[PDB]
Design a protein around this ligand. Structure first.
Ligand SMILES: O=c1ccn([C@@H]2O[C@H](COP(=O)(O)O)[C@@H](O)[C@H]2O)c(=O)[nH]1
Ligand SMILES: O=c1ccn([C@@H]2O[C@H](COP(=O)(O)O)[C@@H](O)[C@H]2O)c(=O)[nH]1
Lengths: 256, 262
């Protein structure tokens, strides 16, 4: 039968980052990842503080922050420790191994110094994971591979998706799961995170497609919903966050 | 591969009725300077980037940046780079590999600390998200008269940018030809002469690195496979004499181009 998050956290071959996430998910009754898609540091830290108790994870796009500094990220880490959530930088590493290693460790962002989780596209081959691993393994980090995408015309389907899964299984010391629209692996130690979620189905003007928490967690078997605009554009952001949390959590309970 | 006869020169392609103005500018610079070399300036310090640009600018048609590895990035460094690009006549290509939904990539191109759209002549995108990635970029880039390259093939071992994926890249380019000016690819992927083909994974001798990079010669990628421009990083920037390395790559790539004419 379907394992609970608490059970999965204790699997022999589970990743320590994966274990930590699943424990705080069970403990807090949230499988909600906030997509903190804002342009100001103050807004990012405000969201993290106000919605931290409602989320298992906060997803960042630091390259969209007009006033990024490393001190902003240290402050985010303080909030993540206080409220108990993981920080996931949605960087979509997608280059040869030698390049991505530098993009993950260095530059002005120093991503590996603050992100628990990053993600990678599998299009370059497994060298992308090999490069990131050289930096992330010593720092006890995790990685998610992009197996499916939520946008219209996505090419992350069929054999491409299957390749994502194979790559993830061959690098289980570093890769802890997937960005996907559905359960793509049958190994329960892998996490499935799903963007393209709003309470009601719909989309945007630029190819985003939305499905309900019930659809993606209940019917499609994913673990975590990633929600941006459904929360951050709402008149009341905490109310929105709690609505998504309840919807996603009840849909998970329904699978048990 | 089969190529039709009477191969067009870069100058001739610059005159085609449906050529993109950025492609036309690049093609004329290539013809004028006898270079189809793009330098991949994969350095950590702004000093190094600008010294490369100044010393190697006359040998190159294009400089490819990864500004997210630049430890001391500022917009002032980009202003200095643009002046060198004007003084030595080359385009600036930020190898950002935009690869997210349209709503997100629009902000990544225009915003944040890098403000990429304000300085890069060219950017590139992966086509995995569907055409929304190009539509989002285009909303920022077309008002600014910029161009875009789509990643149709990759140089690395295990690349999934093959077959139907490559074909989808070409179709997406055609659907957005007011903005997309060509491809990152290992070979000619479209017979349409208005499209540029840029090929990374190039060294004077075939080879590779320890993290999945594969190298082919300029003769192989330009002369045999029909690509237009070679993108070279370590082959030049890891050498003791970089100007000599750059000239060697320029000569090899240019002679290979000449070999396909008339
Ligand atoms: O396949 C994917 C992968 C990542 N994202 C990201 O997830 C968030 C979705 O936000 P929203 O559409 O809920 O505002 C955005 O940051 C977007 O970049 C997707 O939407 N779809
Ligand atoms: O398919 C691709 C796409 C882009 N690059 C980029 O081109 C340059 C190759 O450098 P090098 O291997 O010549 O040093 C790097 O900046 C790398 O990120 C590739 O190598 N292969």
């Amino acid at each position: 039968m379907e394992l609970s998050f608490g059970a999965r956290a204790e699997l022999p071959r589970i990743h320590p980052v994966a274990s930590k996430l699943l424990r705080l998910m069970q403990k807090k009754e949230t499988n909600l990842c906030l997509s903190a898609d804002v342009s100001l540091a103050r807004e990012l830290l405000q969201l993290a503080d106000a919605l931290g108790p409602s989320i298992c994870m906060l997803k960042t796009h630091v390259d969209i922050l007009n006033d990024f500094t490393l001190d902003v990220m240290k402050e985010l880490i303080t909030l993540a420790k206080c409220h108990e959530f993981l920080i996931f930088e949605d960087r979509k590493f997608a280059d040869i191994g030698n390049t991505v290693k530098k993009q993950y460790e260095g530059g002005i962002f120093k991503i590996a110094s603050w992100a628990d989780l990053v993600n990678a596209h599998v299009v370059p081959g497994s060298g992308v994971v090999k490069g990131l691993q050289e930096v992330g393994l010593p720092l006890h980090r995790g990685c998610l591979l992009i197996a499916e995408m939520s946008s219209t015309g996505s090419l992350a389907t069929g054999d491409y998706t299957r390749a994502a899964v194979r790559m993830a299984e061959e690098h289980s010391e570093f890769v802890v799961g997937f960005i996907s629209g559905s359960r793509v692996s049958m190994k329960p130690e892998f996490l499935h995170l799903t963007p393209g979620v709003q309470l009601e189905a719909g989309g945007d003007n630029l190819g985003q497609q939305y499905n309900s928490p019930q659809e993606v967690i209940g019917k499609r078997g994913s673990d975590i919903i990633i929600v941006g605009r459904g929360i951050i554009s709402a008149a009341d952001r905490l109310e929105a966050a709690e609505m998504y949390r309840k919807a996603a959590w009840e849909a998970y309970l329904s699978r048990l």
